[PDB]
């Protein structure tokens, strides 16, 4: 397999891809509810103008007409209640997932923060092994040390 250290940088490379991929997915989620929220505002405005008619409808004694207009309004109200309740539910979805991304981003940078510190330790160890392994080759060992060869000659 490849060197584990190389995978560490490469592994976190894909980690970044998901964060941006996650971010775009979030925005699409954020995009839709405003479209739905705006749609609700238009319909209740359509309901309001019917109420504006209802204000004038029954005025001057034409109560019969106002009944139909309110009958026309209830259809838009049904949309208002159904969509209105859905929008409130959708708020929990977006709010909860935003905290996730906030949690994930905080964790990743801390994870990447430690990566180098132990990479530095790893390079210290190889620098600790390779420095003294050759050091004993000269004289520090009791036997087979090249130093004793000089005296032998």
């Amino acid at each position: 397999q490849e060197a584990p250290e190389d995978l560490l940088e490469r592994l976190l490379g894909e980690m970044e891809l998901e964060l941006i991929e996650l971010r775009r997915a979030l925005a699409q989620t954020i995009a839709t509810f405003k479209s739905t929220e705006r749609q609700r505002d238009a319909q209740q405005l359509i309901a309001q103008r019917w109420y504006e008619k209802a204000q004038a409808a029954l005025d001057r004694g034409n109560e019969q007409l106002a009944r139909e207009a309110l009958g026309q309004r209830q259809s838009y109200q049904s949309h208002t209640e159904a969509l209105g309740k859905s929008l409130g539910e959708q708020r929990a979805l977006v709010e909860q997932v935003r905290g996730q991304l906030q949690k994930l981003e905080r964790k990743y940078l801390e994870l990447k923060s430690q990566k180098n510190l132990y990479l530095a330790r790893l390079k210290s160890a190889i620098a600790a092994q390779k420095i003294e392994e050759i050091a004993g080759n000269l004289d520090n060992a009791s036997a087979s040390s090249l130093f004793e060869r000089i005296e032998t000659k």
Partner: protein, 43 residues
């Protein structure tokens, strides 16, 4: 329009309601306290 404006919300989180009341609460003093010194300054 709704597509791109959403991305602004992401890259640039808006001021929170907690901070929103700050630049109105402390500003209500940054105006009152500031004018309080000015009000007392004249008198």
């Amino acid at each position: 329009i709704l597509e791109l404006e959403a991305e602004r919300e992401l890259l640039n989180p808006p001021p929170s309601p907690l901070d929103k009341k700050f630049e109105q609460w402390e500003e209500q003093q940054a105006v009152e306290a500031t004018l309080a010194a000015m009000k007392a300054r004249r008198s």
